[PDB]
Amino acid sequence: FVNQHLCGSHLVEALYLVCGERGFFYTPKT
């Protein structure tokens, strides 16, 4: 739980850089 909570921090961190202007909707409950 904590590890994937730690891992989720870097994913949204990565999504911000990769997507750029596109943006994204982060949803953990799926």
The residues binding other proteins (CB under 8 A) are 3-4, 7-8, 11, 14-15, 18-19, 22-30
Q: CB neighbours of 28 closer than 8 A, spacing ≥ 6?
A: 8
Please work out the total of residues on this chain that contact Zn ion, with binding judged by CB under 5 A: 1
Rounded CA-CA distance 4/19 in Å is: 21
Closest CA to 3 of 25, 11, 19, 13: 11
Q: Which of 1, 2, 6, 13 binds Cl ion (CB under 5 A)?
A: 6
Q: Which stretches of the chain bind Cl ion, using CB under 5 A? A: 6
Q: Which stretches of the chain bind a second copy, using CB under 8 A? A: 8-9, 12-13, 15-17, 19-29
